[PDB]
Design an enzyme around this catalytic site. Structure first.
Site, short mmCIF file in Angstrom:
data_model
loop_
_atom_site.label_atom_id
_atom_site.label_comp_id
_atom_site.label_asym_id
_atom_site.label_seq_id
_atom_site.Cartn_x
_atom_site.Cartn_y
_atom_site.Cartn_z
N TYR A 151 0.84 -1.19 0.00
CA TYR A 151 0.00 0.00 0.00
C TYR A 151 0.88 1.24 0.00
CZ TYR A 151 -4.25 2.68 1.33
OH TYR A 151 -5.35 3.51 1.38
N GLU B 118 -0.09 -2.81 -7.68
CA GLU B 118 -0.92 -3.82 -8.33
C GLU B 118 -0.12 -4.72 -9.26
OE1 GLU B 118 -4.75 -2.39 -6.64
OE2 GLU B 118 -3.71 -4.26 -7.10
N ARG C 255 1.63 -7.23 -7.16
CA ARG C 255 0.63 -8.14 -6.62
C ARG C 255 0.21 -9.19 -7.64
NH1 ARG C 255 -3.85 -4.15 -3.85
NH2 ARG C 255 -2.84 -3.80 -1.83
N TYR D 60 -8.43 3.85 -3.21
CA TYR D 60 -9.05 4.08 -4.51
C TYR D 60 -10.34 4.89 -4.50
CZ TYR D 60 -5.81 1.06 -7.14
OH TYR D 60 -4.71 0.52 -7.77
N1 LIG Z 1 -2.57 3.99 -1.39
C1 LIG Z 1 -3.07 2.89 -1.97
N2 LIG Z 1 -2.18 1.93 -2.31
C2 LIG Z 1 -2.65 0.80 -2.90
C3 LIG Z 1 -4.01 0.62 -3.17
C4 LIG Z 1 -4.91 1.62 -2.80
O1 LIG Z 1 -6.11 1.55 -2.98
N3 LIG Z 1 -4.40 2.74 -2.21
C5 LIG Z 1 -4.14 -0.63 -3.78
C6 LIG Z 1 -2.84 -1.14 -3.86
N4 LIG Z 1 -1.96 -0.27 -3.33
#
Ligand SMILES: Nc1nc2c(c(=O)[nH]1)CC=N2
EC number: 3.2.2.22
Length: 267
Positions: A80, A177, A180, A123
């Site tokens: 994140y 992503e 991931r 998001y």
């Molecule tokens: N800050 C942030 N980082 C992410 C996501 C998100 O929704 N927000 C999804 C994957 N990394």
């Protein structure tokens, strides 16, 4: 120096090629996963509970074709993007709890200007700000080139929240992503190979929206079979159900820690 600088991973859109991009993603993945703790051949991210602050974050240094640089802060436990640094200023999203807030105070401690956005980096929030859904935001080396630029100029008047949020979304998908999901990495690669910029189709979107769900199912799967069919979307928006982890093996790369590693079967 701060007690052990978190691992820095560099990248630059200057002369990006499919090869360089692959290398970039490789490093990111190899910096997040503990190596051990793998469920059904898929590596799991370390559990936040027993993770010391020093082993909590990974820094992604992004350089631009016009001598600009933005240092993103990635949370190892879930990939994140918590915040970023631009020159001498540091900006972080609004945390969801005291634990994270306590951890954030360790990122970019040498900066002169520290800021914590009132809004969160999830998001849903970012889309509202950008006034555009992910499916209407183009991705590719070009958009990323522009993204890094916006983030950098946020610290120098050229702000415009919608742009700032848009840039974050672009960077998130092309980094977090991508690490991931091997599938998402491929999408970005195809875009780079042909020098293209296009919005993510439904198959990509659904995967992003189902990361945590898949992680849970895989970790609670009866030796591989899902306790319940997980529906997913195709490129055309059509829906189909996944009943076994096998299908997802060449798709998902990383999973968020859910269940405790069972009878720790690694050798
Ligand atoms: N800050 C942030 N980082 C992410 C996501 C998100 O929704 N927000 C999804 C994957 N990394």
């Amino acid at each position: 120096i701060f007690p052990k600088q978190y691992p820095i991973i560099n990248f630059t859109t200057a002369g990006a090629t499919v090869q360089s991009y692959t290398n970039f993603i490789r490093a990111v993945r190899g910096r997040l996963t503990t190596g051990a703790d793998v469920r059904h051949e898929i590596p799991v991210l370390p559990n936040r509970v027993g993770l010391p602050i020093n082993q909590r974050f990974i820094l992604v240094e992004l350089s631009n074709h016009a001598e600009l640089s933005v240092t993103l802060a990635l949370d190892v436990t879930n990939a994140y993007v918590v915040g970023y640094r631009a020159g001498n200023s540091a900006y972080f999203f609004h945390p969801d709890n005291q634990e994270d807030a306590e951890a954030i105070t360790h990122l970019f401690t040498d900066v002169q200007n520290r800021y914590t956005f009132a809004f969160g980096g999830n998001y849903d929030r970012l889309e509202q700000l950008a006034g555009n859904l992910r499916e209407n935001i183009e991705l590719g080396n070009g958009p990323l080139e522009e993204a890094i630029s916006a983030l950098y100029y946020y610290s120098t008047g050229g702000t415009q929240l919608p742009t700032l949020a848009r840039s974050f979304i672009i960077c998130i998908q092309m980094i977090s992503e991508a690490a991931r999901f091997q599938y998402i990495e491929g999408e970005m690669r195809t875009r780079i190979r042909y020098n293209r910029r296009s919005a993510p189709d439904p198959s990509v979107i659904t995967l992003e929206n189902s990361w945590g769900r898949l992680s849970t199912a895989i970790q609670e799967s009866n030796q591989g079979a899902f306790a319940s069919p997980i529906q997913l979307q195709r490129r055309n928006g059509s829906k189909f159900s996944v009943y076994d982890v096998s299908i997802l093996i060449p798709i998902i790369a990383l999973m968020v820690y859910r269940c405790a590693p069972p009878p720790s079967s690694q050798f």
